[PDB]
From a paper:
Connexin 36 (Cx36) is responsible for signal transmission in electrical synapses by forming interneuronal gap junctions. The direct connection between adjacent cells is made by end-to-end docking of two hemichannels (termed connexons) from each cell, each consisting of six protomers, thereby forming a dodecameric gap junction channel (GJC). Cx36 is mainly expressed in neurons and forms the major component of GJCs in electrical synapses, playing important roles in cognitive functions, including memory consolidation and epileptogenesis. Here, we determine cryo-electron microscopy structures of Cx36 GJC at 2.2–3.6 Å resolutions, revealing a dynamic equilibrium between its closed and open states.
Therefore, we reasoned that the particles in a single Cx36Nano-WT sample might include conformationally hetero-junctional GJCs that contain two opposing hemichannel regions in different conformations. We collected hemichannel particles (~13% of the total particles) in the FN group, traced them back to the original GJCs, and removed duplicates. This process led to the selection of 14,155 GJC particles with two hemichannel regions each belonging to the PLN and FN groups, 3D reconstruction of which with C6 symmetry produced a conformationally hetero-junctional GJC structure at 3.34 Å resolution. Compared with the GJC structures in the full PLN and FN states, the map density of the hemichannel region in the PLN state was weaker because of the smaller number of particles used for reconstruction, but that in the FN state was significantly improved in the cytoplasmic half of the TMD, as we expected. These analyses suggest that two opposing hemichannel regions are not structurally interdependent and may have different conformations. It should be noted that the hetero-junctional GJC structure is not the main conformation in the Cx36Nano-WT GJC sample, but is the average of only 13% selected particles, which are still conformationally heterogeneous. In the hetero-junctional structure of Cx36Nano-WT GJC, the hemichannel in the FN state had two flat layers of density blobs blocking the pores around the cytoplasmic and extracellular ends of TM1 or TM2. These densities inside the pore were as strong as those of the lipids filling the nanodisc and were not observed in the other hemichannels in the PLN state. To avoid artifacts from C6 symmetry imposed during 3D reconstruction, we confirmed that the pore-obstructing densities were also present in the density map reconstructed without imposed symmetry. The features of the pore-obstructing densities, including double layers, flatness, and a thickness of ~4 nm, are highly consistent with those observed in the pore-occluded structures of the Innexin-6 hemichannel and pannexin 1 channel, suggesting that Cx36 GJC in the FN state may also be obstructed by lipids.
Numbering used by the authors:
A (entry chain F), B (entry chain A), C (entry chain B), D (entry chain C), E (entry chain E), F (entry chain D): 19 to 100, 194 to 277
The structure:
Amino acid sequence: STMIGRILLTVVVIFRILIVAIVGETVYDDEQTMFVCNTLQPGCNQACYDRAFPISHIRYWVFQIIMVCTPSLCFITYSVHQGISRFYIIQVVFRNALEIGFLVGQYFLYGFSVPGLYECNRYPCIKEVECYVSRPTEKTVFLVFMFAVSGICVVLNLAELNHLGW
Amino acid sequence: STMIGRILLTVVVIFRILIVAIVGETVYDDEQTMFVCNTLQPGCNQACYDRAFPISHIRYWVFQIIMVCTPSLCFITYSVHQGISRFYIIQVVFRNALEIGFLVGQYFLYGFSVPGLYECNRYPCIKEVECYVSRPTEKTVFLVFMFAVSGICVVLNLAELNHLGW
Amino acid sequence: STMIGRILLTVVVIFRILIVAIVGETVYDDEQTMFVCNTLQPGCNQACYDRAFPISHIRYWVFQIIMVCTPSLCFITYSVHQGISRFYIIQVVFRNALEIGFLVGQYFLYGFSVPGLYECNRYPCIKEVECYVSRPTEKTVFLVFMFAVSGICVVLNLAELNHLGW
Amino acid sequence: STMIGRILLTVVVIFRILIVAIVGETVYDDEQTMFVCNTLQPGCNQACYDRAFPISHIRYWVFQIIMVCTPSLCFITYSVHQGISRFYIIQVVFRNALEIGFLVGQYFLYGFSVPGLYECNRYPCIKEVECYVSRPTEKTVFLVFMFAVSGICVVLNLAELNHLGW
Amino acid sequence: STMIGRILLTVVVIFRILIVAIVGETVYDDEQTMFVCNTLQPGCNQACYDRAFPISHIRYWVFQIIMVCTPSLCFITYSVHQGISRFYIIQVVFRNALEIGFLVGQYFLYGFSVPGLYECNRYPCIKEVECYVSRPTEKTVFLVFMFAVSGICVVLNLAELNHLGW
Amino acid sequence: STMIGRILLTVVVIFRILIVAIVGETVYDDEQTMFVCNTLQPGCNQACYDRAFPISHIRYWVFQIIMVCTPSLCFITYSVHQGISRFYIIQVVFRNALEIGFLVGQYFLYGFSVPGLYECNRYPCIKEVECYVSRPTEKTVFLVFMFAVSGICVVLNLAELNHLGW
């Protein structure tokens, strides 16, 4: 039961990397060119887009994917250059911490949906203005799916922690 | 008779992978930039495009392609790390289920054609408006072809299910 | 005399694949953005382009190239997994049939030239309107060249069929 | 003296292929989007561009590069599958003929310069109109350089023909 | 304690290279097309963009990444071609110097944030004008993160310098 | 002292290759689309851009990079096919000549800076007009850096010439 957990963990991790590398690069491609606000102000479009989407989903996901894979490279470099079980335990702890932190950060940054309308009141805009997002449903689907995958990985890492940890 | 079926399953699967990777990436390239509605409303174009095409065909097809290939990687990782016939049976069942689910989902999401006109009545649009789709015939051809290929794969997997299953 | 024919068949097949992969991807790149109609109607451009070019030449050619190479992969998978001469004969028959069918289909779909003007009378256009095609001469040259190459391949396959067949 | 000719021929051939693959793909990138005519006629821009540049330089050069390398693949396939000196002589004759034909065709199609102005009188344009070409000097430089390289290759092939031929 | 420092130095270096190669290429993609100024002057947009962003962040970072890796290639070429400890010491000194210089240069060129507004008074603009930057928050995040990573690398190199140096 | 010179020559050459291949391809990407002139004349933009930038910097640099590496391939092909020291001496002389010629040509074509304004008086423009260049500072930095690198390579080649030559 604990044996299959590693196979499912590696498969989900590679699955996530593949999804992000192959499909995510192109849903967000036109994020800002298709974002439009009802206004005649130069620079209101830029300001309101920046306020609505401070960091794009795909940037956060690439960063998270790369950062949650760093203990593996550290352990590999340590072993190739040269306790070792001590390294295994610490890298497992670190991966668990990183994945819980990244999941919580995703929840706090983005929530669970991307709405189609946005109300912005930042300079140079005059009082509050209404702006319109491109492809909200697809981005919501991607958000929910990525949350599910990250939850799966967190669950597996907690499983292994409780299996080895005392 | 059942022997050649595996070779034809492998060939159809690789054929589908190639078709999606080489051709699908560029029929849908201009899906939203060429989508136009008869209106003077900012944000009506975005809303009506999102309502007409919630998830693009090529996104669904890439996701399906990746998801219907996961039992193979699971089995491979299980064998490389280390009954085995039990794994073969379960992964066959899982592939069958996944392909039937994906085919039914395709039918329920997209139907059998992509019309050239679309009637949309979502905010910020004023009552119902008419919008025009880009490349409807090519997308219809792609839809029908992919449905045919997925049906072929489902048929083959059911064949093997009934051959081994009791 | 029949020996060199196989070498020339292999060379023409690889030649065709190379031509399509390297050059064809970029003549058709701006097919719809440069297509223009003399009208003030929203959506007439989309409708008339779709009626003039239901499936782009390069899509048909990529599909044909991939489909005329499937017997080779089938035979290879059959041999790697494990009469064999029976497989050779059947795959030769199948390749011949596929190439004659694809050549006839090309002739029936596209003809021998791409005109510079197109007259369209599809909704939402008001009566018949005139539209203008981009790069007609280059596309005509490509059409004629591809027809010639496909004819060469058909001729070679019929030659070998009559050499082996009785 | 005849020994070094082979080394210089292979080096010039690879040099030409590299130049075309790395740099030529991007001088011609904006050929039609930057082409402009002094007129208010829809479709005059397309017609006059097609009349001024029936086949783009880079398309002809890629086709020529691929076609002048076909005897090498034919000879290689003939040798891998299995007089041989007879094949060497014939492929040398064929390469010579192909390169002289391609050089003459280049001269007859394009000349020695690309002018900055073009005068066009094709339908739908009203009488003669003036159009303006993008990047004429760079294209002239490329034309002259490619003519020089092709001349070098022709000279080398004639040298070797006269060395072996009687 | 000094042993593990090398593993983290190599891992941080590869981490930084990966981040720059995979994600940085596309935040800055639309830097100038989305930059807009409140004016009716031709050429004011170009002048004010050039004054606000003389060298793009990603250009500086790629240059720095490549330049801080030159001692490694020099040492490798020296060893493959053929004291050696003398080379190790000098290349360590050189890497330390290069990374401190690059960090200070980053601080002096860019600071710690990218503001959303810019005030420009360069010809051809009439007196001072206001311009608006695209994606300021993401660029600020990237700036701060890269500063942190470069600081980490500087710290590690100083650590090892003081470990070996006397 | 003369031993390390070869290592530094190979490292600087590879460094230059990398800089041109990775970063230079994208500073010049929008060279003509962002070039603008203060005028209402069709075709004045094209003419004045062509007069200001006859050959783009990156085209010259790629050509130079490829041309200064041809003696190496010639020598390699000569050795693989089969005095040899005579070849070494001649190829060194040829590389020296090529690099001095290319450096002088760069100086005569481009100078040491790219100005932000350009004054053009070519047909179809009416008398002299003012045009505005995109990204002048970055292009000036690139110019100066490439001049420095090419000077370094020239210096090294002259060093080796005088070391071996008499």
